[PDB]
Amino acid sequence: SNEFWTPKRLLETDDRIFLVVGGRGVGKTFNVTGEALDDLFFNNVSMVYLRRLGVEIDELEKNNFITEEMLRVYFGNRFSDFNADESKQIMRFSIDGAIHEIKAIRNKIFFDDRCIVYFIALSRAGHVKSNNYPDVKYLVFDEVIIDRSIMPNARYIRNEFTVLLNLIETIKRKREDFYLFMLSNVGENFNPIFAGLGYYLTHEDIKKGFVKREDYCVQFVENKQEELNMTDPFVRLGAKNRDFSNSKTNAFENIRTPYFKHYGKKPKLLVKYDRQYLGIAERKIPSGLEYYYQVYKTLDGLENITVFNNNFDTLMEDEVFLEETQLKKKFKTYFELFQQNMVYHESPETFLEWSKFVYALKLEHHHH
Amino acid sequence: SNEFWTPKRLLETDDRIFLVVGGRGVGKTFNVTGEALDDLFFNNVSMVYLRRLGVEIDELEKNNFITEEMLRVYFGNRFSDFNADESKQIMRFSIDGAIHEIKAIRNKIFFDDRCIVYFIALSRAGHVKSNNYPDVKYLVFDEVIIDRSIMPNARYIRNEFTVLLNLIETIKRKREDFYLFMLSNVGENFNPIFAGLGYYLTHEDIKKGFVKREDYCVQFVENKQEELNMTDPFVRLGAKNRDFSNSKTNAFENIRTPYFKHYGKKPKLLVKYDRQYLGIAERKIPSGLEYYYQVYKTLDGLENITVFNNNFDTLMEDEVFLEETQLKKKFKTYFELFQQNMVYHESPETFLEWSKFVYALKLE
Amino acid sequence: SNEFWTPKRLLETDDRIFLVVGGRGVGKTFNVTGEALDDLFFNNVSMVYLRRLGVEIDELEKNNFITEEMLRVYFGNRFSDFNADESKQIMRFSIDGAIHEIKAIRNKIFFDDRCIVYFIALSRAGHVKSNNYPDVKYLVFDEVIIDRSIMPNARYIRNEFTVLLNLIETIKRKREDFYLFMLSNVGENFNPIFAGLGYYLTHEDIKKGFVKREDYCVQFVENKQEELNMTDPFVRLGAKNRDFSNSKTNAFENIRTPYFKHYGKKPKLLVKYDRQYLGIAERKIPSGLEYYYQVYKTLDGLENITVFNNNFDTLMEDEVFLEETQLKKKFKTYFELFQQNMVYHESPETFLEWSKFVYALKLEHHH
Amino acid sequence: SNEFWTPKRLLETDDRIFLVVGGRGVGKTFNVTGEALDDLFFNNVSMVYLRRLGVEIDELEKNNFITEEMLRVYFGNRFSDFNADESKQIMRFSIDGAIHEIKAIRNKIFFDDRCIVYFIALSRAGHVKSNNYPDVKYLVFDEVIIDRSIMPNARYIRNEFTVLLNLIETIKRKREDFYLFMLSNVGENFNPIFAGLGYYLTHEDIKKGFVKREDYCVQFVENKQEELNMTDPFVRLGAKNRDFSNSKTNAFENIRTPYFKHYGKKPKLLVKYDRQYLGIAERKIPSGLEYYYQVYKTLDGLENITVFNNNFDTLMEDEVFLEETQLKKKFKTYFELFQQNMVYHESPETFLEWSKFVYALKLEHH
Amino acid sequence: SNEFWTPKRLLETDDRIFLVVGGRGVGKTFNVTGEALDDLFFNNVSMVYLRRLGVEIDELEKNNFITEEMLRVYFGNRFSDFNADESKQIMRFSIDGAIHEIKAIRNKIFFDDRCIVYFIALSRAGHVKSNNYPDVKYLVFDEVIIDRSIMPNARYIRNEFTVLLNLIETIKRKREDFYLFMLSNVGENFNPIFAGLGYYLTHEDIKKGFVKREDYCVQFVENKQEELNMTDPFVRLGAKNRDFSNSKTNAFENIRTPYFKHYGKKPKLLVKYDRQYLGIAERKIPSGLEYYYQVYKTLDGLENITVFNNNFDTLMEDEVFLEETQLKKKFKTYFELFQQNMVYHESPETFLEWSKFVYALKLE
């Protein structure tokens, strides 16, 4: 009867950055979008719908982004008779006895001849920042985490999290009131979005529906297990095929938690990042080698470890500059080892710091 | 038209899921559609026409999906004068003295400005939200089994039957009254659709027109070879070309029956699927190897056989997770061996269980 | 000119299937279309314009299919003032003092809000047969034989003739009055269309303008030698360039006649097709091998030669089934030898029987 | 005298085919178009603007093809007040006290709701109906010769000149009053257009402003040196970059002159083309071989030299049939040697005849 | 807050070529565009917005190129009530009591049915020069220098500066009053634009906000350190990610200064460019070779060293022509060595001369 998930709890807290994970088919996009229409229609505000890849937007049904059922549930009795024409891709409806119309053209949705929704893709939006969106209060990131099942080969954009942040500034031109919604159908570690936020996924946090951080709040949406009527043939048929049943809870199936271990010796190499020094230490073992990733706040006790510097300004003394060509030779193999859970991190905090560094420089990795 | 086959017998039985096989050119889709207009017009209900490949829908002439002949035979004495305009894809007709219009625009057909028929393709079925299709009582899947002659290379969607079920669930939002029609011009084993239903095609079931199961009914429609008027040149020309003539009776030409043999020895590997354990056992022979595919209800007697688990959550203890990248290597040859009839299956029931597993994970 | 060729002679004979070859620029498409308008306009009948490849239809000018010059020549004095609007793809004209309008949208042409012409492509026609073209009296297959000059690489559909035959049956359901027009700018052997008809192209048949078979008629159009006004500079320039001049007579340049020889020995393999047995025999010669393609009506004297069966139902006993993966292994090299004029055929009738078999099972080109 | 080029001199001669080369920035297209309007407006005549590649037309601004300035210079005081609407591409002006409007929509420009200018691309030329163009008196081919600078990689259409001739015949239907204009910003040998015309570019012809041939006239337009005002900052900045300055006189920089030498010995192979026999003769030299391309009218003295025939119909007697797929292997290396200036040609007449043969069958594959 | 940068100072000086570097987020394009409207509306003048790649223009929002705020800040009280319709991209407003409308369709913006702004891409600009813009006073090049971080793969157009210069002459035909603006978010050496202008970037010039050349003036805008509101979550998040924070001051982070050294010995090869001869000299060293790029005013003392000449017309006698195939064999490796700072340059002036040569003939 009532929509399972609502964005209200997230809106009530002070934080303005919300991350919603799991519960695909629950209409997260339906409810997040649904809440805003109240604002978009009469507060002279617009919304930007963000997708990672430009291909995803072209396939998206823009005529159905705002649907009659959506208007009817959020406005209810206030919503009047609705007489849309699908050939012309125009919707006419009346609210409060006042006529309004929605028409979807190109990548924009128009309400009473005013643009309320912008459809832009991160792969294309990043390439031009001269664009300017005058009034935007809501940015929504849908399917923000890659799902291997839906898409066999999908690669996160290069230095993705930084590209997104720069896009925020262009969309949000020093606006006090701005909201960001990130919606993921599946949640797992080792993505750049988690690295940027700094959130580390753990089963305990999954058990607790709500987790609180300083900058953002992440809420976990789990679709209630419903007694399935076995008199219905379609329900029985879905039950016989297990691959169908398992799809519902696949979101939190695997979180890709990484290994943790402590190693006393000093790293083979150091790289200075974020007023910090990252080091990798190798321990020789009979079968091969064992790799340990560490973070050092200071260089005390590490006189002779070579230091690589990514940034030109911060370089000083003997540290060697790190160029695009150089970082591949030294760190290509180390990055591949990082992506897979083949390495030991001293603590979860160090894993986040390393994630920020790795996902900034990750590139290509196609057929390698 | 509707003379040979009617869906009325299927509607008369209790089951709500129907599989119709064979009898191409008999207007199966015409009559399933034909019966439903009765509801679509006046019971405030709609229908969805489902095709596997988006190409099948784009090329389909949607304005003629509902034709005057159809309207006239199903409404009969009620049907009045009919004045259609083809340019705007509008039909004007009166039933019971009430004027109505059917307009087809884009992938939807409207009856009195209400959508009664939706045209959607299974390849695109993903990213279709339930709000787009409010009221649907009928889903019709046409040409559900691949035909080798019509299309040279056509591949069932990866994990297709699961894709279909999600489409069922999205379209049918806990609706008690829902009907599924699966219409196939040709019937043969080794497709995912038969596997999903759990139906195994056999000549005995083909001779008996109707087979009932717990969830569905499958009815086989075969048109008897009709005397061809040899005065018409087009008919005369078709007779001279044999590949065309054999196409008429192509539906049940080959049912792809698979080999069956039993091997006592224990399997080489185990993979846990569907609350069960599937194993492949190899018997060495002078020329090479002989393959036996088995199903184990339980692990009794199989202490140390390695177990691969498709699902991460259910995995436990010594079972090693099987991810898609690591999976290809192990089961590539076994999947090739399954698709080509090169392995021995213990029984048809195990063959069906293996079909579910294979077609869920198949990749070309 | 438009008055050069007329389909009238073809219509006068009883046969309903016509194959027109050669004479590029003679307006075969213009006149075949021209004859029908009387029917399309006033007999509540429609026409289907069929092309092999979807590329041919998308590039085709939908608006210019029916032109003012066309309407005027076939209707003449009956044709009234003509006031077309080029922007919106609309034509308004009056016939017998009655106003009519022709509009072209997407792949259809409409006359008085009724669809008279359908544009559909054979490559896409196979995917869907449930479509309903309600009333069709005319089906036109244009540029039915591939010309390498116009199109460097063009591939016939796999099992093409059956795709076409299925399309005939889908378009023409229950119609006593139906006409098929096949129009080729160039005529040559070794195409699947000729194989399906059973017609074998020969220089003698080209000399006689008209040939009659049981099912169809083939008429050969050769453009009469025309006096070239030298005085015109553009005419003088075209003469200097031979590739331009040779294009005019390109239709019958090469008819791809195949070699014929008889070999007594029995074949290496047999394949059963059309209640007959086709065989290939190899004769070893010092330089290499010599291939002979034969047809046997019966198995008498061929006890132990292996027999391949294309169709599963008819297969029996010692015959080994021929699957798609199998025929490529056995017959890929033999099919290559057939396409290139490298084998000896016993007679033209066996060549046709072999052509039907090859083009039914032919491998899809690599790409 | 008159620093501004006009097509009047070209129009005065009898010939109807004109090739204009060089002088980029002189407004060749501006004046060729400009001269015709009197006919287009009041003689019920249309013009066709032809470009090799569709890309050139799509980027082209069709509205400004006919501009107010163009109208004023040719019509002058006779031209009245002009109040055009740029949004809808509708211009408003009166001539001789009669109001007129020119509206540009899609690939056509309409004058008083009548089409006077057609914009069509040679790449897209296929499947255009002759009837579509009832009356066309002017065909203008702009940038007809490829310029290496404008486009890093640019390819002439396969068998282009034959493609052009088919398009000429379709547009023109025994029209006595028909004109062909070919405007090229750069002139050089070894293109199919020169091969088709039969024109061989030579510096003497460039020094002589005007050249007449049987079918056409070629006029060379050279823009005078204009003392460049240094006061403009843009001009001084251009001076520092030399690659920019040389572009103005780039047209006649390189004419691709081919080597000429005569060789007495008889050829190695013969191929029959155009009722003629082409031959390639090789002279052995210490470093390698020397190639001489010759043309023979008759086979006298050439008894046993093999003859290849491209066309099956004309084939006869001892000639061995050569098919398009087989033809390339035999002549691939010889064709490569022709395109790069590495062979000796008997005369310019033979060089053109070889060009016609090569450009008809030259093909690239991968 | 307040526009950190305004174009008025640049407009005040005589020179007509301005190069603006750095200060991302300052609305350089916002203020340059804003200043011109006074001219575009009432001086019967137009403007051309230049982007390197056509991809950059298609993604650009033509309706938001001119925004109500920009209108409001530059005209202020003069601006009246504004009620635009975004559906058709038509704005209506009144200035000085006179009603006007600007409608943006395709790649053009029209003011009172007159085109004031043209959107063209440099990659496509070459192929069509016949296009004639009757009145153009402003040409603006935005993001003129490539930024490696924002765009993964970005190529300077081959011979870009000449392509731009040819475009200048076509757009500006005999116009005395013309202004060119070049706005770059990042400033670094080794781009063709700096080479074409002849400006050599140096940190000393970065400290001084304004640098004056003869042909042009270049102004450097660095966005002053502003206290970041740490109540805003987005600002708090950016501080944690260092790569994001550096982006604002990334412009002048690295200028790619090249090494400079003089070598007396004569070069291996000479290439004549701009009535001068560039030479590369190799000194054999144990690890490998050391490359020195030099400029010679005359050939005295270099009688027999090979000379490559780029232009055929100027080529004469012993000079060897430099063709597309020939320039790949000799100079492919030398160009790779130039792009990376692996070579020694005699002076900064010679480096610019080598830059003119390299970026004119470089191929990717």
Numbering used by the authors:
A (entry chain D): 5 to 372
B (entry chain E), E (entry chain C): 5 to 368
C (entry chain A): 5 to 371
D (entry chain B): 5 to 370
Task: Quote the passages of the study that discuss this structure, keeping the authors' original sentences.
We present the first atomic-resolution crystal structure of a multimeric ring form of a viral dsDNA packaging motor, the ATPase of the asccφ28 phage, and characterize its atomic-level dynamics via long timescale molecular dynamics simulations. In contrast, a close homolog of the φ29 ATPase from the related bacteriophage asccφ28 (gp11) has been shown to form highly soluble functional rings; extensive analytical ultracentrifugation and small-angle X-ray scattering experiments show that the ATPase forms pentameric rings in solution. Individual subunits within the ring are organized into two globular domains connected by a linker domain, each of which is nearly identical to the corresponding domains of the φ29 gp16. Like φ29 gp16, the N-terminal domain adopts the canonical ASCE ATPase fold, while the C-terminal domain is a ‘vestigial nuclease domain’.
Two crystal forms of gp11 were obtained: (i) tetragonal crystals belonging to space group P43212 and (ii) trigonal crystals belonging to space group P3221. While the three structures described here were determined in the absence of nucleotide, the active sites of ASCE ATPases are well characterized and can be accurately identified. Two distinct conformations of the Walker A motif are apparent in our crystal structures. One conformation binds either a SO42− or PO43− ion in the canonical β-phosphate position. The ion forms hydrogen bonds with the backbone of the Walker A motif in lieu of a β-phosphate, typically provided by ATP or ADP, which explains why the Walker A backbone adopts a conformation similar to a typical nucleotide-bound ATPase configuration. However, because the structure was solved in absence of nucleotide or nucleotide analog, it lacks any interactions mediated by the α- and γ-phosphates, ribose sugar, or adenosine base. Thus, this structure likely represents a conformation with mixed characteristics from both the apo and nucleotide-bound configurations. However, the crystal structure of asccφ28 gp11 ring reported here shows no such helicity in the N- or C-terminal domains. We suspect that we do not observe helicity in the crystal structures due to lack of substrate DNA imparting helicity.
